[PDB]
Motif scaffolding. Structure first.
Motif, PDB file in Angstrom:
ATOM      1  N   UNK A   1     -16.247   3.614  -2.124  1.00 47.01           N
ATOM      2  CA  UNK A   1     -15.967   2.948  -0.863  1.00 47.01           C
ATOM      3  C   UNK A   1     -14.504   3.142  -0.508  1.00 47.01           C
ATOM      4  N   UNK A   2     -14.226   3.203   0.790  1.00 45.35           N
ATOM      5  CA  UNK A   2     -12.861   3.420   1.243  1.00 45.35           C
ATOM      6  C   UNK A   2     -12.039   2.150   1.078  1.00 45.35           C
ATOM      7  N   UNK A   3     -10.904   2.269   0.396  1.00 40.34           N
ATOM      8  CA  UNK A   3     -10.000   1.152   0.209  1.00 40.34           C
ATOM      9  C   UNK A   3     -10.002   0.552  -1.177  1.00 40.34           C
ATOM     10  N   UNK A   4     -10.811   1.066  -2.095  1.00 40.04           N
ATOM     11  CA  UNK A   4     -10.905   0.490  -3.429  1.00 40.04           C
ATOM     12  C   UNK A   4      -9.666   0.837  -4.234  1.00 40.04           C
ATOM     13  N   UNK A   5      -9.154  -0.146  -4.977  1.00 42.47           N
ATOM     14  CA  UNK A   5      -8.018   0.049  -5.878  1.00 42.47           C
ATOM     15  C   UNK A   5      -6.831   0.686  -5.167  1.00 42.47           C
ATOM     16  N   UNK A   6      -6.513   0.186  -3.980  1.00 46.19           N
ATOM     17  CA  UNK A   6      -5.407   0.733  -3.219  1.00 46.19           C
ATOM     18  C   UNK A   6      -4.080   0.198  -3.740  1.00 46.19           C
ATOM     19  N   UNK A   7      -3.015   0.938  -3.451  1.00 46.89           N
ATOM     20  CA  UNK A   7      -1.683   0.593  -3.925  1.00 46.89           C
ATOM     21  C   UNK A   7      -0.701   0.537  -2.765  1.00 46.89           C
ATOM     22  N   UNK A   8       0.591   0.453  -3.078  1.00 44.63           N
ATOM     23  CA  UNK A   8       1.642   0.462  -2.076  1.00 44.63           C
ATOM     24  C   UNK A   8       2.621   1.611  -2.283  1.00 44.63           C
TER      25      UNK A   8
END
Lengths: 48, 48
Positions: A3-10
């Motif tokens: 899925x788009x956006x999983x485990x996102x960072x900065x």
């Protein structure tokens, strides 16, 4: 990624894309241990 | 895509949208085997 956006960072480069070097598993007592690539130094950095 | 954002690839060109050239299925024992286009060589690359 499922899925788009999983485990996102900065950061500016998602660290997940770089190749892996270790592996995580559970001990006898359900404790998280790790095993990276430098543990093989006693095997591949030998005269053989 | 049933949900916008599924199987999102970080690459600039989604490899999912190209024409497919193989097919996947399961073995007798439940092992993922593949069968690609080049397996039809013995049939379509004949003299007949």
């Amino acid at each position: 990624t499922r899925h788009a956006g999983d485990f996102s960072t900065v950061s500016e480069q998602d660290p997940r894309q770089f190749p892996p070097q270790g592996i995580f598993f559970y001990n006898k007592d359900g404790i998280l241990t790790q095993l990276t690539l430098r543990d093989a130094m006693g095997t591949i950095c030998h005269s053989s």
